Design a protein around this nucleic acid. Sequence first.
RNA 1: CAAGGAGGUAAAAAUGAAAU
RNA 2: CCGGGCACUCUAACGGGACUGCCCGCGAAAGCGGGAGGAAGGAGGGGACGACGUCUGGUCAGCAUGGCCCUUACGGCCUGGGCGACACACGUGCUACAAUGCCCACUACAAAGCGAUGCCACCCGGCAACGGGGAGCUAAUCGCAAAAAGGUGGGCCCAGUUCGGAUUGGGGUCUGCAACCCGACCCCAUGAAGCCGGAAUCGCUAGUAAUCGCGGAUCAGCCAUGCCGCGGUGAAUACG
Lengths: 155, 118, 128, 206, 99, 92, 60, 82, 25
Amino acid sequence: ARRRRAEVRQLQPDLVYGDVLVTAFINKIMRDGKKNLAARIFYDACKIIQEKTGQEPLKVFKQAVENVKPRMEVRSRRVGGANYQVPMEVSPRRQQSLALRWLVQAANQRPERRAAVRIAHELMDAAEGKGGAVKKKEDVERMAEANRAYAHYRW
Amino acid sequence: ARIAGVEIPRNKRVDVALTYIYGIGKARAKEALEKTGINPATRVKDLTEAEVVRLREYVENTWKLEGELRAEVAANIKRLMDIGCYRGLRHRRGLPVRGQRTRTNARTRKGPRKTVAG
Amino acid sequence: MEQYYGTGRRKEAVARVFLRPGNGKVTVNGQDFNEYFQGLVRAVAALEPLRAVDALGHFDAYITVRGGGKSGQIDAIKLGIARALVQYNPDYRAKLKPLGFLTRDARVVERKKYGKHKARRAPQYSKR
Amino acid sequence: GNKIHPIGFRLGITRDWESRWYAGKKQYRHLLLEDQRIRGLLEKELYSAGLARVDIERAADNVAVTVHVAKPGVVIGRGGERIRVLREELAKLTGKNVALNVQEVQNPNLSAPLVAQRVAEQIERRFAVRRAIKQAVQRVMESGAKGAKVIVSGRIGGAEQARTEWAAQGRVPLHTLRANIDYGFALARTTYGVLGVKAYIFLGEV
Amino acid sequence: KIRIKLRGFDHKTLDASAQKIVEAARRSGAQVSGPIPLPTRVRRFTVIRGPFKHKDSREHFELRTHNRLVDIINPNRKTIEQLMTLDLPTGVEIEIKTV
Amino acid sequence: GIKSFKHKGLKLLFEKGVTSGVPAQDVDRINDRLQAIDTATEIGELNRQIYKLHPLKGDREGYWSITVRANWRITFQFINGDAYILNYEDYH
Amino acid sequence: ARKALIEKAKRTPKFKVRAYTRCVRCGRARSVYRFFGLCRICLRELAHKGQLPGVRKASW
Amino acid sequence: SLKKGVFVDDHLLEKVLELNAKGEKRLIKTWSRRSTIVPEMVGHTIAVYNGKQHVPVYITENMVGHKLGEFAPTRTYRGHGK
Amino acid sequence: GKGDRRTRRGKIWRGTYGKYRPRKK
RNA sequence: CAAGGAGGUAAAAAUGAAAU
RNA sequence: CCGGGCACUCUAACGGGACUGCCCGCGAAAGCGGGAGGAAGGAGGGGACGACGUCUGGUCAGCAUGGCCCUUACGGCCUGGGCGACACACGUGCUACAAUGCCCACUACAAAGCGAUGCCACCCGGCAACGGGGAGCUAAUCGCAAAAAGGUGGGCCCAGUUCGGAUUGGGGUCUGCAACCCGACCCCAUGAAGCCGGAAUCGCUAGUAAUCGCGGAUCAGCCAUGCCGCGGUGAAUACG
Ligand SMILES: [Mg+2]
Ligand SMILES: [Mg+2]
Ligand SMILES: [Mg+2]
Ligand SMILES: [Mg+2]
Ligand SMILES: [Mg+2]
Ligand SMILES: [Mg+2]
Ligand SMILES: [Mg+2]
Ligand SMILES: [Mg+2]
Ligand SMILES: [Mg+2]
Ligand SMILES: [Mg+2]
Ligand SMILES: [Mg+2]
Ligand SMILES: [Mg+2]
Ligand SMILES: [Zn+2]
């Protein structure tokens, strides 16, 4: 019954960058608890960003996250055996989490061969507003758009 | 190149291309090309015809392989035809040869499930 | 040549940190602070307390390490480096506390408990 | 229910051992079997003494054995028998230094094994169990105890229906470590079956 | 030159009985390396708590076997005299060898 | 006629005459009910007062249960003049 | 088969592999520890009794 | 799979060899697969025990590492409702 | 390939050694 | 700042079990 | 490795160490929030500990035991068989369907434990299992063990394929009186099903889940992928 509001977990800043965000992204890359392979892939992809574009990956990655941020999402709620879906706003914590999660997932959805090039490209596509994650973001906002009827149920 | 009974594997490393023969596997593979004296990492794409001839001559001879040894293997099971042992009956009933568990599993010899119900 | 305390521990890892006041930013033990820790991204985070202070290579590192794996050793080194510069510079306390570079971090591997499959992972069931 | 043996629960701090010797492998097994056969042989022809303990100590062929008894009446002065061949019959499968001592347990009403054994005798005397429990507790409580508790379970007074008679005065905290709680148990053999008597005796600690 | 080892299950009896020999050797004309605490050899075993068949939730026990070392210098029969047969253990196993 | 056994004790008692599967005082009782379940051409014949016959409910539907003694039941399935899955079970 | 069966367990002749462990206090053939020569059941009993030298509850 | 042993029952062989000089009768039993096929006395029948009875198995070359009881199945199976 | 008897990885998992996993040096 | 009285009231969800 | 030294690390024996005691705010109190204080805090993180009683719960196959029954036998010995049977159904799992992946080579970094009726260094034969030798070790001394995931290099290039390892043929080794039914490995060759799972269903809130190897009990050997422990790297999220 959540007596404690569960305090927000804080991370360690990365190497060379100091991000309070990049490490969170590396973590999503991480599988089976191998931060070595995870971090390597991201920094690898950072080197890949430099090639296809003359931009610093610290902004390319930053803007990509900003473009894959759900303004509002759909929430299933009350009365009628939980029949309604109230479109709710998204907390900065949750926009944060969804952005990075959808990025990595869409990144591994790509037909490319190497994990680094998937990350790099999906970030470049998302920075422009083209990524498959941006599709996911825009999709979730469609659902939230179509439910404005009983949005006044709010909460 | 029609090495034994097969020819299929083109552009894909001779140490690997060799594997595509019933009788070669992996150990006899590099064993055959070190004894014939050929580079394993080659193209397989019809390279030096001489290397291919030597390879063919050694491989196809030496040990039995392809359809010939399939016949021998099948004949070794035919050994336990006659009035054979227990191991033959396991080849007869279609059940696992090495006395394992057949209460469950053993699907690789029994085949897919049939379901009786009762 | 010289000596400066050194006791860094983190998750079954022991690291004795010295540092000798010289411009040669050096290594210890096996090979380089690199070399011995190459391919490991977070390995260079052990030198962050030096970045927290005014040490751009003013000391000659000498850390013998043992026990655990690399990451714990690296973590322990961080505790040892900090334990040195706080020792011979008692006024460098007002940075090891706000930044929190001084903690043994009691976070250690929890015991396998019976019944459970491993630590906390329950063995999974069906009623039927 | 399910509760751990209040003796084993202590062992370390509070309540020491009962067989105190050290050995490595290839020896422990043999010396433990001998040790237990001593306890087994003693219990038989020494029950009339009512023995609270059977402490045992060793030091390479030394085997010391201390028998605690409420009333050591079955020792009778040196060559008056009841000790001579009796402490010498141990070495018929031992042959080692059968050093048998006898202790005088002062108050039997504060010795848990003795309490339970007195109760278990009364069950076989066909006594009224519930009244026997009550008295034994008060008897223990009468002799200065800080807390007591006796438990007989099963087949009470014959009669087809297993019961469990319960009585306890004062304080008996089993969960506490600094407890000094004596635990005893006894089998009452009856013409209608077998029932078990638990006895808890408690004194202060800190 | 004289090396003595003291093994034991109870640590309190060991830490005390192997300290007597530090006093009975120092006050007899010798240098004594104090109670050397050799590591313990813990011998655990895990038993199912019930006589029946309740596999989950059992209860385990351990048999800690402690080792303690003490060395005395010169093997003079002045220190030897006391540590010869003035033994006060409770079963504590003692090893005496010189090398 | 009986055709199958789910209890090994009952099975041995009826087949070989091995009485070391059932209670010693219930050998004559268990015998005369099994024989009556054997000669039974229809469940209607297993209707004597002393058996206390009755079909079970729930997940035990399709099963019958005459009483041997006390809380002990001989449960089975009767179909087409034969009984199957003869079990000597405590009604719990 | 129990009394004549704790006989064989100590008799131990005829082929070396036919010999087996067996609790001494009981007659248990399973979960018999070589160290004590006891089954897991008996071992627990005596460990709570205190009749097992050094043997103590494990908490960590 | 033995190599330097490769054994047959001494008692099976005792009975088999002392009934091998210049000929015999096929009346010969056993109680142990444990043995091995044994060359010589090939034209023989060895009634092997399968746990229930003695099955007359016949030797006609072809067999070797297969001792006996492989020629004496212990179970029956036969079918599963079908 | 933790179950293939022809790998250093499968030989680890099985425990045993051999040709596909020599006893060091 | 402390409620007395008036009114819109959940859904889809049935059964019992084998000596006292 | 020696001389020598034992301050570091470690070993194991007793201790110190926070009790929201100190600051602000709230309150009648308890207490709650917040803050320098330190390794640590408002039960620090885990263990052992399971009230009166409930389930005619479980256990006569650990053992004890009332009653009933068996005694040239329902007891006793032995060889052999069986518990390992298989048209099927369910539970708990192991290994996978691959490229944050596989293979080969090189090269690091643990803990907790076990061993002289055994662990077996180092040589020798052997593709290997393993066998001949044979040193040290009553073992923080010698050995089991090189930890594995990691790193460095190189090779496959996404295809049932260097994924996956089932099944089967052959050849061997070791324990054992003996391994057909029914043992574990080693080597050659076969290389299946599987390309990620219907209705449903489980676990875990911080060293945690996931993932990686290591030890032990039982044990001649082993069907252990099990159970009980050990450490390595190490997430996500909790509005409510
Ligand atoms: Mg089988
Ligand atoms: Mg299935
Ligand atoms: Mg773990
Ligand atoms: Mg389980
Ligand atoms: Mg109805
Ligand atoms: Mg408590
Ligand atoms: Mg019941
Ligand atoms: Mg009995
Ligand atoms: Mg079974
Ligand atoms: Mg397919
Ligand atoms: Mg595919
Ligand atoms: Mg929780
Ligand atoms: Zn026992």
